[PDB]
Enzyme design. Structure first.
Site, PDB file in Angstrom:
ATOM      1  N   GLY A  21       9.327   1.587  29.656  1.00  0.00           N
ATOM      2  CA  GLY A  21      10.597   1.538  28.936  1.00  0.00           C
ATOM      3  C   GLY A  21      11.591   0.513  29.456  1.00  0.00           C
ATOM      4  O   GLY A  21      12.268  -0.148  28.666  1.00  0.00           O
ATOM      5  N   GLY A  28      10.682  -1.880  32.052  1.00  0.00           N
ATOM      6  CA  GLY A  28      10.007  -3.047  32.628  1.00  0.00           C
ATOM      7  C   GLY A  28       8.491  -2.959  32.615  1.00  0.00           C
ATOM      8  O   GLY A  28       7.909  -2.281  31.764  1.00  0.00           O
ATOM      9  N   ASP A  81       5.875  16.024  35.039  1.00  0.00           N
ATOM     10  CA  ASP A  81       5.259  15.222  33.978  1.00  0.00           C
ATOM     11  C   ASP A  81       3.745  15.043  34.192  1.00  0.00           C
ATOM     12  O   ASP A  81       3.198  13.955  33.970  1.00  0.00           O
ATOM     13  CB  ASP A  81       5.966  13.859  33.891  1.00  0.00           C
ATOM     14  CG  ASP A  81       5.826  13.200  32.522  1.00  0.00           C
ATOM     15  OD1 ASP A  81       5.591  13.906  31.518  1.00  0.00           O
ATOM     16  OD2 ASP A  81       5.966  11.963  32.453  1.00  0.00           O
ATOM     17  N   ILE A  87      -0.350  -5.286  34.681  1.00  0.00           N
ATOM     18  CA  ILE A  87      -1.299  -4.159  34.744  1.00  0.00           C
ATOM     19  C   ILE A  87      -0.673  -2.819  34.298  1.00  0.00           C
ATOM     20  O   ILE A  87      -1.210  -1.746  34.581  1.00  0.00           O
ATOM     21  CB  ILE A  87      -1.916  -4.027  36.166  1.00  0.00           C
ATOM     22  CG1 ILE A  87      -0.824  -3.843  37.230  1.00  0.00           C
ATOM     23  CG2 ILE A  87      -2.757  -5.258  36.495  1.00  0.00           C
ATOM     24  CD1 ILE A  87      -1.360  -3.495  38.601  1.00  0.00           C
ATOM     25  N   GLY A  88       0.430  -2.894  33.558  1.00  0.00           N
ATOM     26  CA  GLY A  88       1.191  -1.709  33.169  1.00  0.00           C
ATOM     27  C   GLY A  88       2.489  -2.100  32.485  1.00  0.00           C
ATOM     28  O   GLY A  88       3.049  -3.161  32.767  1.00  0.00           O
TER      29      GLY A  88
HETATM   30  O1  8PV Z   1      10.608   2.827  33.505  1.00  0.00           O
HETATM   31  C1  8PV Z   1       9.531   3.302  33.173  1.00  0.00           C
HETATM   32  N1  8PV Z   1       9.476   4.503  32.524  1.00  0.00           N
HETATM   33  C2  8PV Z   1      10.660   5.320  32.179  1.00  0.00           C
HETATM   34  C3  8PV Z   1      10.354   6.250  31.016  1.00  0.00           C
HETATM   35  C4  8PV Z   1       9.379   7.251  31.137  1.00  0.00           C
HETATM   36  C5  8PV Z   1       9.105   8.101  30.061  1.00  0.00           C
HETATM   37  C6  8PV Z   1       9.806   7.959  28.862  1.00  0.00           C
HETATM   38  C7  8PV Z   1      10.779   6.968  28.737  1.00  0.00           C
HETATM   39  C8  8PV Z   1      11.054   6.115  29.809  1.00  0.00           C
HETATM   40  C9  8PV Z   1       8.257   2.563  33.468  1.00  0.00           C
HETATM   41  C10 8PV Z   1       8.259   1.184  33.784  1.00  0.00           C
HETATM   42  C11 8PV Z   1       7.064   0.513  34.045  1.00  0.00           C
HETATM   43  C12 8PV Z   1       5.849   1.189  33.995  1.00  0.00           C
HETATM   44  C13 8PV Z   1       5.819   2.562  33.683  1.00  0.00           C
HETATM   45  N2  8PV Z   1       4.622   3.302  33.616  1.00  0.00           N
HETATM   46  C14 8PV Z   1       3.275   2.723  33.778  1.00  0.00           C
HETATM   47  C15 8PV Z   1       2.925   2.653  35.242  1.00  0.00           C
HETATM   48  N3  8PV Z   1       3.529   3.345  36.221  1.00  0.00           N
HETATM   49  N4  8PV Z   1       2.911   2.980  37.414  1.00  0.00           N
HETATM   50  C16 8PV Z   1       1.990   2.102  37.110  1.00  0.00           C
HETATM   51  C17 8PV Z   1       1.081   1.475  38.097  1.00  0.00           C
HETATM   52  C18 8PV Z   1       0.082   0.566  37.693  1.00  0.00           C
HETATM   53  C19 8PV Z   1      -0.752   0.031  38.660  1.00  0.00           C
HETATM   54  N5  8PV Z   1      -0.614   0.375  39.941  1.00  0.00           N
HETATM   55  C20 8PV Z   1       0.305   1.236  40.364  1.00  0.00           C
HETATM   56  C21 8PV Z   1       1.180   1.817  39.464  1.00  0.00           C
HETATM   57  N6  8PV Z   1       2.000   1.908  35.781  1.00  0.00           N
HETATM   58  C22 8PV Z   1       7.019   3.238  33.423  1.00  0.00           C
END
Ligand code: 8PV
EC number: 2.7.11.15
Length: 457
Positions: A145, A147, A261, A141-142
Site C-alpha cells: 500500500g 511502497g 493477520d 520482490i514484493g
Molecule cells: O505498507 C504495506 N502494507 C500496509 C497495508 C497492509 C494491509 C492493508 C493495507 C495496507 C506494505 C508495503 C510493502 C510490502 C508489503 N507486503 C509484502 C511484503 N511484506 N514483506 C515482504 C518481504 C518480501 C521479501 N522478503 C522479506 C519480506 N513482502 C506491505
C-alpha cells in the site's frame, strides 16, 4: 566499501565509555556474539588460566591426532553445552569452572589485546550511519500500500537482505503514519533472540523521502501464491508449515505480541522452502493493555476479535492458525464458502458455523482443528495456560521432534523454482540498528577475515 576497524588507541575512551554504563561485566560482554567469540579465543590461547580446560584439550589432541578450528568448535558445541554458560551430580564443579571463567579469566581478558579488539568492533557498531550507498539494490520482490520490497546486498559484508522501502509522500497522502511506525515498534520487539520463523529486522533508516526496513530476505514467494500453483496440500505437507508457524507464534507471544493477520499470503518462503511470518504492520503489543479492535482479514479473525467490546490477546492467533491450516488443506477459509465477497456473512459464519470436516481427514487432524477453532477462548488449544506447548502436544504432531523443527532439519514439501518540515520530525527515532543482528551478520561474513587483516597491521 569494506569494514575498517579503528586503531587500538581508542581503547581508553571506549573502555571508560562502557565502564560508566556498567557494560564491562561478564554477563554483558559474554552474551554478545562478538564478545563471546573474542573471549573464547582468549581462553583458547591461555588455557593454563582455567585448570580443567588444559587437561581436557591435552587429551583431545591425542584422541584426534591433530595437525585450532577444532578447539573453537569443541568450545562452542561441547564445552558451552556442558556448562550452560533437574539436579546434576557435577553442579558444584560446573559452578567452580564458571566462577573462574567469569572472574579471573574475564579480568585477564579485560586487560588483554582481545578486549582492545572488542572495543574496536564495538566502536564500529556505535558508528553505524546507514544510507542507500551502503546497499546495492537489485529487483523488486514484493509490493504494498505504501511502497515495495527489493532484494539487496549490504556492501561492507556482502550479506543479502530484503529492503522494504516505504514512500513518505504516499504515507502522508494516505494518513498511515501511525501504522508505518507501529511496524517499526513491532519489528523492534520481535527481532531479538534470533528466530528462524519470522521475517525479522536488522536495520531501520530513512532518507529525504523513503522509510527503509532491512529485513530477512525471503526469495521464494508466499503460501497464497504457491497454494494456487500447487493446489491443496496433504496432511504430511501441511504439518511442516504448521510446525514452523507455531514456533513463529510462540516467539511473538513470548514477547507479548499478538500478530492478528495470520493468513497464507503473509507466510513467505525462502529459496529452500522454509517459511517465516512477515508483515507485522497489524500486530499489537499486549504487555500493558489488551486490544479490543477488530483487526485482521475477515475469514481469519477469531470470535473474540469480532465480538464488540471484548478484549483479546494471543488467543486470536491460534484461531487464525486453525482457519489457515484448513485453507492449506481445502483451498478456502472455513467461513468463506463460495468465494464470497460479503464480509458480514463471513463474520456471522465465524461465530455460528459448524465446520464440516471430510472423512479423508485423520482423527489426529480433527482433534487439532476442532481444538484451534473452538469459539470460546476458555476451551481453545493454545489458550488453556501453557501457550504453544499445548498445540505442540497435539496428536497431529505425535511423531515430530520439535528440536528438529526449530533447527529446520525436516525437508520442505515445496522447493520454489529458481528465478513538509514537521512531518520529518515524526520519523526521528526511526533509525535503529539491532546490535544482536549486526553482530550475527559480522560473525557469519567478515569477522574472521577482518581480524586476521587487522592482526597483521
Ligand atoms: O505498507 C504495506 N502494507 C500496509 C497495508 C497492509 C494491509 C492493508 C493495507 C495496507 C506494505 C508495503 C510493502 C510490502 C508489503 N507486503 C509484502 C511484503 N511484506 N514483506 C515482504 C518481504 C518480501 C521479501 N522478503 C522479506 C519480506 N513482502 C506491505
Amino acid at each position: 566499501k569494506k569494514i575498517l576497524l579503528p586503531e587500538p588507541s581508542i581503547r581508553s575512551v571506549m573502555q571508560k565509555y562502557l565502564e560508566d554504563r556498567g557494560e564491562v561485566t561478564f554477563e554483558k560482554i559474554f552474551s554478545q556474539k562478538l564478545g563471546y567469540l573474542l573471549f573464547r579465543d582468549f581462553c583458547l590461547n591461555h588455557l593454563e588460566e582455567a585448570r580443567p580446560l588444559v587437561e581436557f584439550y591435552e587429551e583431545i589432541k591425542k584422541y584426534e591426532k591433530l595437525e585450532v578450528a577444532r578447539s573453537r568448535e569443541i568450545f562452542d558445541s561441547y564445552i558451552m553445552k556442558e556448562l550452560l554458560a533437574p539436579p546434576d551430580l557435577f553442579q558444584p564443579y560446573i559452578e567452580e569452572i564458571c566462577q573462574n571463567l567469569r572472574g579471573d579469566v574475564f579480568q585477564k581478558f579485560i586487560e588483554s589485546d582481545k578486549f582492545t579488539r572488542f572495543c574496536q568492533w564495538k566502536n564500529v557498531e556505535l558508528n553505524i550511519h546507514l544510507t542507500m550507498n551502503d546497499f546495492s539494490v537489485h529487483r523488486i520482490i514484493g509490493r504494498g500500500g505504501f511502497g515495495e520490497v527489493y532484494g539487496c546486498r549490504k556492501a561492507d559484508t556482502g550479506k543479502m537482505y530484503a529492503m522494504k522501502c516505504l514512500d513518505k509522500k504516499r504515507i502522508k497522502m494516505k494518513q498511515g503514519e501511525t501504522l508505518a511506525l507501529n511496524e517499526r515498534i513491532m519489528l523492534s520487539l520481535v527481532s531479538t533472540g534470533d528466530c528462524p520463523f519470522i521475517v525479522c529486522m536488522s536495520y531501520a533508516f530513512h532518507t529525504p523521502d523513503k522509510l527503509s526496513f532491512i529485513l530477512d530476505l525471503m526469495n521464494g514467494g508466499d503460501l497464497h501464491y504457491h497454494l494456487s500453483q500447487h493446489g491443496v496440500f496433504s496432511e504430511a505437507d501441511m504439518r511442516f508449515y504448521a510446525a514452523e508457524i507455531i514456533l513463529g507464534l510462540e516467539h511473538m507471544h513470548n514477547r507479548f505480541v499478538v500478530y492478528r493477520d495470520l493468513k497464507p499470503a503473509n507466510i513467505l518462503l525462502d529459496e529452500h522452502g522454509h517459511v517465516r511470518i512477515s508483515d507485522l504492520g497489524l500486530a499489537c503489543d499486549f504487555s500493558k493493555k489488551k486490544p479490543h479492535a477488530s483487526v485482521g482479514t475477515h475469514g481469519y479473525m477469531a470470535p473474540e476479535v469480532l465480538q464488540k467490546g471484548v478484549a483479546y490477546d494471543s488467543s486470536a492467533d491460534w484461531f487464525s492458525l486453525g482457519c489457515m491450516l484448513f485453507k492449506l488443506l481445502r483451498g478456502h477459509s472455513p467461513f468463506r464458502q463460495h468465494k464470497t465477497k460479503d464480509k458480514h456473512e463471513i463474520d456471522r459464519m465465524t461465530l455460528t458455523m459448524a465446520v464440516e470436516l471430510p472423512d479423508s481427514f485423520s482423527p489426529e487432524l480433527r482433534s487439532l482443528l476442532e481444538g484451534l477453532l473452538q469459539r470460546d477462548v476458555n476451551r481453545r488449544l493454545g489458550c488453556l495456560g501453557r501457550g504453544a506447548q499445548e498445540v505442540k502436544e497435539s496428536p497431529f504432531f505425535r511423531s515430530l521432534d520439535w528440536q528438529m523443527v526449530f533447527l529446520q532439519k525436516y525437508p520442505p514439501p515445496l522447493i520454489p523454482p529458481r528465478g513538509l518540515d514537521s512531518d520529518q520530525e515524526l520519523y526521528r527515532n526511526f533509525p535503529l540498528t539491532i546490535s544482536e543482528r549486526w553482530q550475527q551478520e559480522v560473525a557469519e561474513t567478515v569477522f574472521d577475515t577482518i581480524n586476521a587483516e587487522t592482526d597483521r597491521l
